[PDB]
Symmetry: none
Subunit: 311 residues, 4 copies
């Protein structure tokens, strides 16, 4: 079933390209022909972006819904705040400074007619720092390993959500979540298509080094509790290494008395590493319990049954 | 009292031997004579296993109830997802590659007539990695120490649960639990019987080294919070040992100075070990609070009544 | 207001003195004159204690309510399990093997008529290990410091609770709690009286070294989250000690070159202590956050207003 | 819009200067001319402070509403307990020993006429321990960095809150919060004004060294979870430094061997530095997870709307 469509867009000091964005979005949604609404979310922009929001609000026959926040909460928080005041169904989330061509929105909607609950974009010809490209590849393989299904582009925010799934993510107790991955978790039928990607024209990058670390750290912590087990494994490796050094130095003690001058300090020094190993494995044990606590306080569903058959 | 019985079996990419498993389970249930249902749970198998589930569905007069998941959650999650859509009573959990002979299911049901709420299986002549056998023995002694009652083999998925106990597991908020251990905790009358063991045959084992570590960490976390207190005790031992060595070395220093050349650094090391021990103590204290958090978030019923009498 | 009284007693392999305990409790409650009920809780006793429970249940005109558990849960858990099936009001909790003379129960009830919500026993002439007496004194001063009121005897289990407060502790999300201290937390009007203490006659001590550590460790963790801050303080002390040693060795470097032969190892070893200190303060920071988590997951009330006055 | 106003004041053993405080507050409220109420909150004061509360109660035509607690919970808990039984709007929090002149209360109320939801006080010419002044400056720069908006002095209890915002704090499950910081987080329109500062005079300060450490740790935990990520960054720096030293020392060893006698222990120390760094990384990972635990157990509303418009 398809009804009133709503497109939710964040914005953060992007008033330079904003009027062109509004014109292109209006043209695309009018070309779609289905009844439409627009919800722009201001994340406490410094400049006169809220002023343009109010100006768009005053303009009659505009389906814009102006919402501005008291604080820069983070983008994902802004998409979620837009999710709070959704109307109709088939929520469309789009970039602010036209990094994603809005003209593609009907195609997603068209593919939304196929029946897929989640619609994603490949976003081909993506360009970034080569180290960041390698990080994207490794996190993509990690997320497809953990989830058991491959999803092309995580960083792309051009996505479509149905009303039931957006309600489901409204209900969840999670804070500081990653919208695409959480939506993919609550998916019955998902798909992805390629779309053209264009560089930022008037606007500049609003993701600093600290913001980059925060966003992919948030993504990795929202993904799984696996990395804590890695700490336990590293501790186990260090402990076995320390024990091997201890037994080798016992062999040396059985051998010539002075090894590398006085190896006496070495006799305790190696077991210091053993103690370090022990402390690391202790960290691992704590980590696993913390992981469990996290898995229980998120109230993540246990099984999401795809289908059931009776005789 | 015993009624309509249903058997819940997980599956993950076991279509190779699956039709023979279905035939043997149907034959065993028909030989039992009691009204029966079968529930296969697919954990998002890669191959055409869901296809065989649907094919069994269309088969006329089938008691199969095929349930398909959206992803590979893991085994215990699949058993509990099957537990969600159970009917009747005396739920029996089997394997997907005939490692446990299904022909033994009436015997459990027969012992279910005795009145035991949990009926476990002693796996006889079980063969595995000798290190893994030693790990099984140490976990068995740990669980019998903690529970105060010894049970044969926790690892066996062949087990029997009554409807009240399965409801008890259904109520809890605990994510990533171990079904047999939790059932043993929430038990009124438990027993165990020996059963023959067979290999995977055509099928292969799916539990890898990482999956083995994950599951045994899961079971130790689900059983008790004791190991954090064990860490605190180990830290206490290291701290007291370090302090004793420190005082002995300072006594030797006061007794004589020229006995060694660099014994000074020995006292320098003698304190840092105490620091390391003290650091472990911190771990212990931290751990205990997380223990409570765990005990507080899982919402475990503190007491369960074995048998209540109201005199009048 | 006063109605049907109930006395809840745990038991754990104490069938040797059990019949005499039942006779004395029945005599005392009959002497009280108020309508009475008795609830004995078996903590999975090995011997034929459940057999005596059933025998007492079969005996007509007995207000005993026989409840036995599937597992040795711990005593406090057994008192809580008795708390589950309470009837009437003024719950009386008593020791099993007559360490506390039951003949004093009406006096508590008599003082319960004064209006105090919580009734405690001093339990004078208490005898135990001198180290354990010192531990009792220090934990008593700690609990009176933390709570801001003094309460005589924590280890004494002869206590009286009203129905509202027992309902309050039933409602709480806490697991493995300490009944007397938790009751004192939810107190509007509390009091304590001295009572005679008698040694165990037929029964032996059922608290081993491991059980002793478990019980007072449970008490201290249920009391406050203060001990985690002690970790941070000791980390700060070790860090400042390491920094002092580092600056003294810099002074020595300014002084004669070789101090105690080669002090370069000392130079780096001081900063090793510095790193250890830093790690300990990290421990402290984690500890504080865990403390907060514990305080919020317990759902402990924030203020318990004693009284309000309007103009 | 501004209506009936109430002033909430904590107290803990401040009966020495209390009658003068009550007289000055009554005079200031009468000079204001708006309908007014006073709520004193006693945090289980040892001396006869509750007695003076009751005596003020019996006093005819008094707007005082005396509330007495069963124990010394602490300050912030007492302010929020007073927040429980508030009436009207524009709640003002004062001090119990006249350190902040009550005569300034109408000015806040006057600035409350401007429309600001939060009205804070700049405590001018404030004097304290120079180390504590430096601590105040560093916490101020930290909070203005995290919030993105600079506020004068967090430590001042003289502040103004509107009824919607006080309801917002009343709704949250957070135990042991810092009221001014939380109010600044849940703010629509905030401002600050300078006010004269006076000493405790007859009264003494109640915040001891342990209480100071407790409160500033409370405020840093209530503000942000940043310091755990700072610990992870410090660990990363130590790890990379240790690895660099290790590779430099092995390069020097390959270049020459007889340059030193015991350079071996140098590499031995270098690797354990890397281990220490890794341990700090472990702290970082754990603390981040605990951060999430903190965020989702406190149930903070992720977004708050400054101003919503529905075009039509
Ligand atoms: O704190 C922030 C930072 C960014 N954004 C949004 O994120 C967009 C960033 O767009 P883009 O993906 O083109 O930036 P890039 O990844 O190219 O730096 C901004 O326009 C905002 O709408 C936000 O809402 N809050
Ligand atoms: O990711 C997995 C792996 C296995 N299984 C189930 O667990 C069984 C494990 O089989 P088996 O006992 O033969 O392997 P083992 O435990 O001996 O390694 C499989 O047949 C499946 O039914 C599952 O549900 N999910
Ligand atoms: O695991 C346990 C241990 C003890 N108890 C109860 O604690 C009592 C101990 O009595 P007492 O205080 O006289 O022992 P003591 O402190 O003298 O060793 C037993 O009789 C039981 O009722 C229990 O219920 N569960
Ligand atoms: O345990 C305490 C200590 C203090 N206070 C309150 O906090 C005030 C602190 O006074 P002041 O600001 O003069 O002390 P400072 O913060 O300067 O140390 C007291 O008057 C009380 O109203 C409280 O509620 N509980």
């Amino acid at each position: 079933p398809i009804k009133k469509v709503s497109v939710v867009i964040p914005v953060y000091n992007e008033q330079e390209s904003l009027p062109e964005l509004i014109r292109r979005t209006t043209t695309a949604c009018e070309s779609l022909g289905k009844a439409w609404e627009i919800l722009l979310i201001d994340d406490g922009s410094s400049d006169s972006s809220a002023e343009l929001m109010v100006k768009a609000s005053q303009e009659a026959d505009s389906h814009i819904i102006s919402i501005l926040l008291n604080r820069n909460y983070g983008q994902h928080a802004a998409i979620m705040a837009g999710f709070s005041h959704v109307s109709g169904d088939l929520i469309i989330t789009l970039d602010a400074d036209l990094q994603n061509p809005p003209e593609e929105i009907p195609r997603l909607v068209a593919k939304a007619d196929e029946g897929f609950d989640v619609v994603g974009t490949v976003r081909q010809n993506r360009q970034d720092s080569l180290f960041r490209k390698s990080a994207s590849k490794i996190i993509n393989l990690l997320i497809q390993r953990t989830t058991g299904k491959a999803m092309g582009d995580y960083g792309c925010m051009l996505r479509a959500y149905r009303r039931p799934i957006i309600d489901t993510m409204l209900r969840c107790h999670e804070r500081s979540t990653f919208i695409p991955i959480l939506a993919n978790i609550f998916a019955r039928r998902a798909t992805e298509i390629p779309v053209h990607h264009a560089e930022r024209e008037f606007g500049d990058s609003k993701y600093s080094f600290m913001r980059l670390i925060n966003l992919m750290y948030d993504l990795v912590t929202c993904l799984t509790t696996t990395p804590l087990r890695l700490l336990s494994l590293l501790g186990s490796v260090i402990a076995i290494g320390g024990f091997s050094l201890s037994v080798l130095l016992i062999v040396l003690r059985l051998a010539l008395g002075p090894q590398w001058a006085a190896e006496g300090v070495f006799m305790l020094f190696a077991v210091l590493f053993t103690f370090i190993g022990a402390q690391f494995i202790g960290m691992g044990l704590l980590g696993e319990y913390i992981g469990r606590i996290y898995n229980d306080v998120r109230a993540r569903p246990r099984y999401f049954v795809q289908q059931v058959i009776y005789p």
